[PDB]
Design a protein around this nucleic acid. Structure first.
Ligand SMILES: [Mg+2]
Ligand SMILES: [Mg+2]
Ligand SMILES: [Mg+2]
Ligand SMILES: [Mg+2]
Ligand SMILES: [Mg+2]
Ligand SMILES: [Mg+2]
Ligand SMILES: [Mg+2]
Ligand SMILES: [Mg+2]
Ligand SMILES: [Mg+2]
Ligand SMILES: [Mg+2]
Ligand SMILES: [Mg+2]
Ligand SMILES: [Mg+2]
Ligand SMILES: [Mg+2]
Ligand SMILES: [Mg+2]
Ligand SMILES: [Mg+2]
Ligand SMILES: [Mg+2]
Ligand SMILES: [Mg+2]
Ligand SMILES: [Mg+2]
Ligand SMILES: [Mg+2]
Ligand SMILES: [Mg+2]
Ligand SMILES: [Mg+2]
Ligand SMILES: [Mg+2]
Ligand SMILES: [Mg+2]
Ligand SMILES: [Zn+2]
Lengths: 60, 155, 118, 81, 127, 99, 25
RNA sequence: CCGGGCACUCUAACGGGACUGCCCGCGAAAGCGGGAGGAAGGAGGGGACGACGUCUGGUCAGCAUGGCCCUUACGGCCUGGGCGACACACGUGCUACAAUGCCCACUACAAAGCGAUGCCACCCGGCAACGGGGAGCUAAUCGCAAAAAGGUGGGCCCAGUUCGGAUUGGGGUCUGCAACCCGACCCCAUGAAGCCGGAAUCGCUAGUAAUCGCGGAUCAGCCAUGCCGCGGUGAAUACG
């Protein structure tokens, strides 16, 4: 996303309903995992390099 | 079935009458996976073959099944020139299933409001011969009668 | 026999036949049945011309019914229209009044589809 | 709905309550369509905003519980062909 | 003093206790025909009994959990199957050809991304 | 009456960890009832595999919290001091209480 | 069926509770 | 529930275990059939895994990034609106058209996940949504929780109906600064189209397809019938 936008996300005050979570890697507003604070593309990205602790691709 | 000869699904025999051809029938009454409902229907039907008729309901069943077993049918085949309609004999396995199918379909068409009463009469009528499910069996054999001309194109 | 307006139900059940009255059903029905202490499982065919007037007098008097009821709902909407309000426009134009989506099927409130070219 | 509630923005609620006891009543533009209307709003002319422009709306007693944005619609239509 | 077997079908697990008696069967502190009342296939739960000829020779105390009533029933079946093969394990002779000695490895297949039920796939479009 | 709750994201380390504490108690003191695995709590993340739009074709990952419990009945102060400074964990977590 | 919120089955479907699907156990 | 034991079930780590390795048949071997094994075979069932490349495939709106382009704005803040528009047209779906079905009552049997900025037992208030109160749980230890179909009992009696619940009227609950545009939910009233769907057309070969419920992610709340998953019951049919 844009800069003024990736900022305003963090300026959280004024009517706490407005705070929306955002990716702390991207700026990406959509599909941001509460847990990691990452967006879905970055979670796939970091998890692949191993840089996500105890996070391994599953199967069954 | 490109590689295989496609082996036959083999059924666990009935609990009460102790019979495969029943369970195989039971299945065909089963709508959306409820086996309970199916036998609790079929069984409630044999109840109806009883107080109503003085026979022994399994024995009728084996009969109504044999009465509804189509002896020959007509399958399509593709030849030089047009696509045809050729008479051939039904396999043992097939008459089995064909019979089983028609019984239920015809049965469910009879107007009677409860279900088990429909299988009751249809299994009765079929056995006694006048069944609407037998009408179908005949109508098929006739088709293979009328096409006896094309009887030399069979495999 | 007949309850408010004309509205004669019959045979069936008493609790069921009561639904056939406009303004009434299910809840409002099983309500007036123990409020007149009348058996609901019974059939309107037979019952004491007493518990018939018991049963009529209650309902007709308790809450408002088919004649004056419909007349009220008519008047609510007239009010909602012509006041100029947005609920009222979607009554005026025959389009769905509470949210929903008109890009595709509104059909119940829109009538049957009337097609055109591309 | 609300109930322990009945929310009305106080921007205009001032100028409304004020135009009751001032002695004067005249034309007031607001952006608050989220608010509810009346009782002391009645007789008063209010200009709501649809996203496009401020729209005059005359206020009467049967407009009571209704939000202000009801009488100022947000779109333009006039049919298709 | 008593005889035991283990069996499970499809997430339901069965603990089976067998001591000789009249032929009473108990299922999780219950009479068999109360707990399983109204279920058609109930009696096939103890097949190897009549297939071993032991009729009212054994009583049964059985605990069972997991899965569902009607697949629990093929679970208990393996209990009686491995219990009756405990007392005089010549009963393997005719038990296994009847099939009563195998576990049904058939379980719910999972789901796959992009599919719908795990085989069933969403309707095709083309247009 | 004194109990240890063990957690960690890798069971290759988590096992080899509780196994040291077993002999840092058994050998060094009073009884400790053997390592019991508590069931594993699984956070799972299923996600669309590409950046743009292919909704079918997701990759998924999971994060395993594995729990392992060991109970201690009778305190010896060589146990405790072993259970104080003799610590050799890394990505494991440890907890103790007197209840 | 599953769409009538005035019944047990309806409520269950929608996942709600009320006069027709009281919360009790 | 207490003592007690963990033996069983299980929980979860480590191994074992089938390799056409054995017998007969075939065969030149590889392999194929067939039998006895065994819990399991002929790669046991299911994942994860995608060759050189193709589609100048997709994405400059995740990100990165060469080039081009705007600079009191092509940047930046806000309030309000729109993305939710409706003569229509298509894709994917949900709920149905009922009696193997609907309703009410009682009665059972799962799995996987979530939760101490939350999940909330239990008592009261309320028809109810929900609201007061208020205990336990950093959680195999308390809670979400009722699984549902099933079972039993009774009712409806073939009717556009105790089918079906779309539309609309009035009354409210909750979140939220705020629900006109645009929320979800409860109740009373309303009860529409629909009596298995033209040409055409999709999925599925087994614990599958049907069908039945349950959980999570996002998330204040929710337009989720979606999506990723979990188990319950459980068919049909392959000549070729
Ligand atoms: Mg938000
Ligand atoms: Mg977000
Ligand atoms: Mg709209
Ligand atoms: Mg297991
Ligand atoms: Mg899709
Ligand atoms: Mg399933
Ligand atoms: Mg497509
Ligand atoms: Mg209904
Ligand atoms: Mg063998
Ligand atoms: Mg091979
Ligand atoms: Mg490979
Ligand atoms: Mg860019
Ligand atoms: Mg801008
Ligand atoms: Mg704005
Ligand atoms: Mg959109
Ligand atoms: Mg849908
Ligand atoms: Mg009609
Ligand atoms: Mg709105
Ligand atoms: Mg009809
Ligand atoms: Mg259709
Ligand atoms: Mg296949
Ligand atoms: Mg949510
Ligand atoms: Mg759901
Ligand atoms: Zn990101």
């Amino acid at each position: 996303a844009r800069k003024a936008l990736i900022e305003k996300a963090k300026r959280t005050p004024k009517f706490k309903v407005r705070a929306y979570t955002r990716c702390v890697r991207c700026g990406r507003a959509r599909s941001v995992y509460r847990f990691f604070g990452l967006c879905r593309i970055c979670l796939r990205e970091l998890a692949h390099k191993g840089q996500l602790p105890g996070v391994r691709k599953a199967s069954w | 079935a490109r590689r295989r000869r496609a082996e036959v699904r083999q059924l666990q025999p009935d609990l009460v009458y102790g019979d495969v051809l029943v369970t195989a029938f039971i299945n065909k009454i089963m709508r959306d996976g409820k086996k309970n409902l199916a036998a609790r229907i079929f069984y409630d039907a044999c109840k109806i073959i009883q107080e109503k008729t003085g026979q022994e309901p399994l024995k009728v069943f084996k009969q109504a099944v044999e009465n509804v077993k189509p002896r020959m049918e007509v399958r399509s085949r593709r030849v030089g020139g047009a696509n045809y309609q050729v008479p051939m004999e039904v396999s043992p396995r097939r008459q089995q299933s064909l019979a089983l199918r028609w019984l239920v379909q015809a049965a469910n068409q009879r107007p009677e409001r409860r279900a088990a009463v429909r299988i009751a009469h249809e299994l009765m009528d079929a056995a006694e011969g006048k069944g609407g499910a037998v009408k179908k069996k005949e109508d098929v054999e006739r088709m293979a009668e009328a096409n006896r001309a094309y009887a030399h194109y069979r495999w | 026999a007949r309850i408010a307006g004309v509205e004669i139900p019959r045979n069936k059940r008493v609790d069921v036949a009561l639904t056939y009255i406009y303004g009434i059903g299910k809840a409002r029905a099983k309500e007036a049945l123990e409020k007149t202490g009348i058996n609901p499982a019974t059939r309107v065919k037979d019952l004491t011309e007493a518990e018939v007037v018991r049963l009529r007098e209650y309902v007709e008097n308790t809450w408002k019914l088919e004649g004056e009821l419909r007349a009220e709902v008519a008047a609510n909407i007239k009010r909602l229209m012509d006041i100029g309000c947005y609920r009222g426009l979607r009554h005026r134009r025959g389009l769905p009044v509470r949210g929903q989506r008109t890009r595709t099927n509104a059909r119940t409130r829109k009538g049957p589809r009337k097609t055109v070219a591309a | 709905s609300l109930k322990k509630g009945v929310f009305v923005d106080d921007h205009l609620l001032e100028k409304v309550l004020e135009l009751n006891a001032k002695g004067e009543k005249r034309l007031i533009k607001t952006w608050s369509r989220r608010s509810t209307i009346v009782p002391e709003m009645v007789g008063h002319t209010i200009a709501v905003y649809n996203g496009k422009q401020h729209v005059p709306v005359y206020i009467t007693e049967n407009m009571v519980g209704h939000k202000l944005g009801e009488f100022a619609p947000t779109r333009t239509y006039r049919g298709h062909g | 003093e008593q005889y035991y077997g283990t069996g499970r079908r499809k997430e339901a697990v069965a603990r089976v206790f067998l001591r000789p008696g009249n032929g009473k069967v108990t299922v999780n502190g219950q009479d068999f025909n109360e707990y399983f009342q109204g279920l058609v296939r109930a009696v096939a739960a103890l097949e190897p009994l009549r297939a071993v000829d032991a009729l009212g020779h054994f009583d049964a105390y059985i605990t069972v959990r997991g899965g569902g009533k009607s697949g629990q029933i093929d679970a208990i079946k393996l209990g009686i199957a491995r219990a009756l093969v405990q007392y005089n394990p010549d009963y393997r002779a005719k038990l296994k050809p009847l099939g009563f000695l195998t576990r049904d490895a058939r379980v719910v297949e999972r789901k796959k991304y992009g599919k719908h039920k795990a085989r069933r796939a969403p309707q095709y479009s083309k247009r | 009456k004194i109990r240890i709750k063990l957690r960690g994201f890798d069971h290759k380390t988590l096992d080899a960890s509780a196994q040291k504490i077993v002999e840092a108690a058994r050998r060094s003191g009073a009884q400790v009832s053997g390592p019991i695995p508590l069931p594993t709590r699984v956070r799972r993340f299923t996600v669309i595999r590409g950046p743009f739009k292919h909704k079918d074709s997701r990759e998924h990952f999971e994060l395993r919290t594995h729990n392992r419990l060991v109970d201690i009945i009778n305190p010896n102060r060589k146990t405790i001091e072993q259970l104080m400074t003799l610590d050799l964990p890394t990505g494991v977590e440890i907890e103790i209480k007197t209840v | 069926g599953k769409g009538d919120r005035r019944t047990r089955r309806g409520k269950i479907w929608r996942g709600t509770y009320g006069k027709y699907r009281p919360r009790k156990k």
